[PDB]
């Protein structure tokens, strides 16, 4: 976290100070046609990344998702919806993993679940070592 790479020779200091550097007033708007509609300004540091020639910060990772409710022959209650949120991907890829090592996972809507995999077979606490000594 210290990418001193602006070569940056000190010849910009007589025209732009160090504290007043890349700082601009950002204007905020709570405009919702309501009684509590506020306008506000704040003055923060401005950062950017190199990707934003074609994918700017409003359009960053916003892809149109589709949700379809359709029962069989139920077009009077069937519906389509459309939104583009800030879409995150699925949960991360695991370890390389050797002769199995109980491959992990996760699924379902309410909660993340997550089980345990022995490469296809999903053991997950059945206690196969069941040997009393009578």
């Amino acid at each position: 976290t210290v990418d001193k790479e602006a070569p940056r020779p000190e010849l910009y200091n007589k025209y732009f100070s160090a504290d007043r550097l890349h700082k601009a007033p950002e204007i905020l708007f709570e405009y919702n046609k309501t009684k509590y509609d506020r306008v506000g300004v704040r003055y923060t540091e401005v950062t950017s990344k190199a990707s934003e020639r074609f994918f700017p910060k409003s359009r960053m990772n916003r892809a149109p998702v589709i949700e379809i409710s359709y029962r069989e022959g139920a077009v009077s209650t069937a519906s389509v919806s459309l939104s583009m949120p800030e879409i995150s991907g699925p949960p991360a890829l695991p370890f390389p993993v050797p002769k199995g090592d109980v491959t992990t996972t996760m699924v379902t809507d309410p909660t993340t679940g997550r089980l345990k995999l022995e490469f296809k077979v999903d053991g997950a606490a059945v206690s196969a070592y069941s040997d009393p000594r009578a």
Binding site: K35, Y36, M106, P110, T111, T112, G113, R114
Partner: protein, 172 residues
């Protein structure tokens, strides 16, 4: 006790899975309103003896049969125990204001409160009409624009009503 963050822990511990990403942006909406929660509990407990004695006074005005001799709240032992329970609901409602759910109000104070009152014989319809004075003396207290800057806190005053009507239907 449980607050709102302790809800979805135990609402996913029996479910088993981790915290999903579609829930927590509603919970990071709640910390935007975290500063409009703590003024509002400070509005109630600064006036915590002027909502009690101004509403017990307006209770015995309309119902003179409680302070008449042979009434329920007649003696000085049972007057002090009427002002005690009128302040007890004012604590456990404001405990539920700061937390985000009802589940300390109706687990430590409302779980058998009307069946406490049926055994003692107090009029359980009449404690609800003292609480609804304290509802109107506190919702109209928490809409002042002095001490705070202005802005729409209309979402957070319905939660303060919604536990005052939860004690209004607990005691009957």
């Amino acid at each position: 006790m449980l607050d709102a963050f302790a809800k979805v822990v135990a609402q996913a511990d029996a479910r088993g899975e981790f915290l999903s990403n579609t829930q927590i942006d509603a919970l990071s909406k709640m910390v935007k309103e975290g500063n409009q929660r703590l003024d509002i509990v400070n509005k109630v407990t600064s006036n915590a003896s002027a909502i009690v004695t101004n509403s017990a006074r307006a209770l015995f005005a309309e119902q003179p049969q409680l302070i008449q001799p042979g009434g329920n709240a007649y003696t000085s032992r049972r007057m002090a125990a009427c002002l005690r329970d009128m302040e007890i609901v004012l604590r456990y409602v404001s405990y539920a204001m700061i937390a985000g759910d009802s589940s300390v109000l109706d687990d430590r104070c409302l779980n058998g409160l009307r069946e406490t009152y049926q055994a003692l014989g107090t009029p359980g319809s009449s404690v609800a009409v003292a609480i609804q004075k304290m509802k109107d003396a506190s919702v109209a207290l928490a809409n002042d624009t002095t001490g705070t800057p202005i802005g729409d806190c209309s979402s957070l005053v319905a939660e303060l009503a919604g536990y005052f009507d939860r004690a209004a239907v607990s005691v009957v």
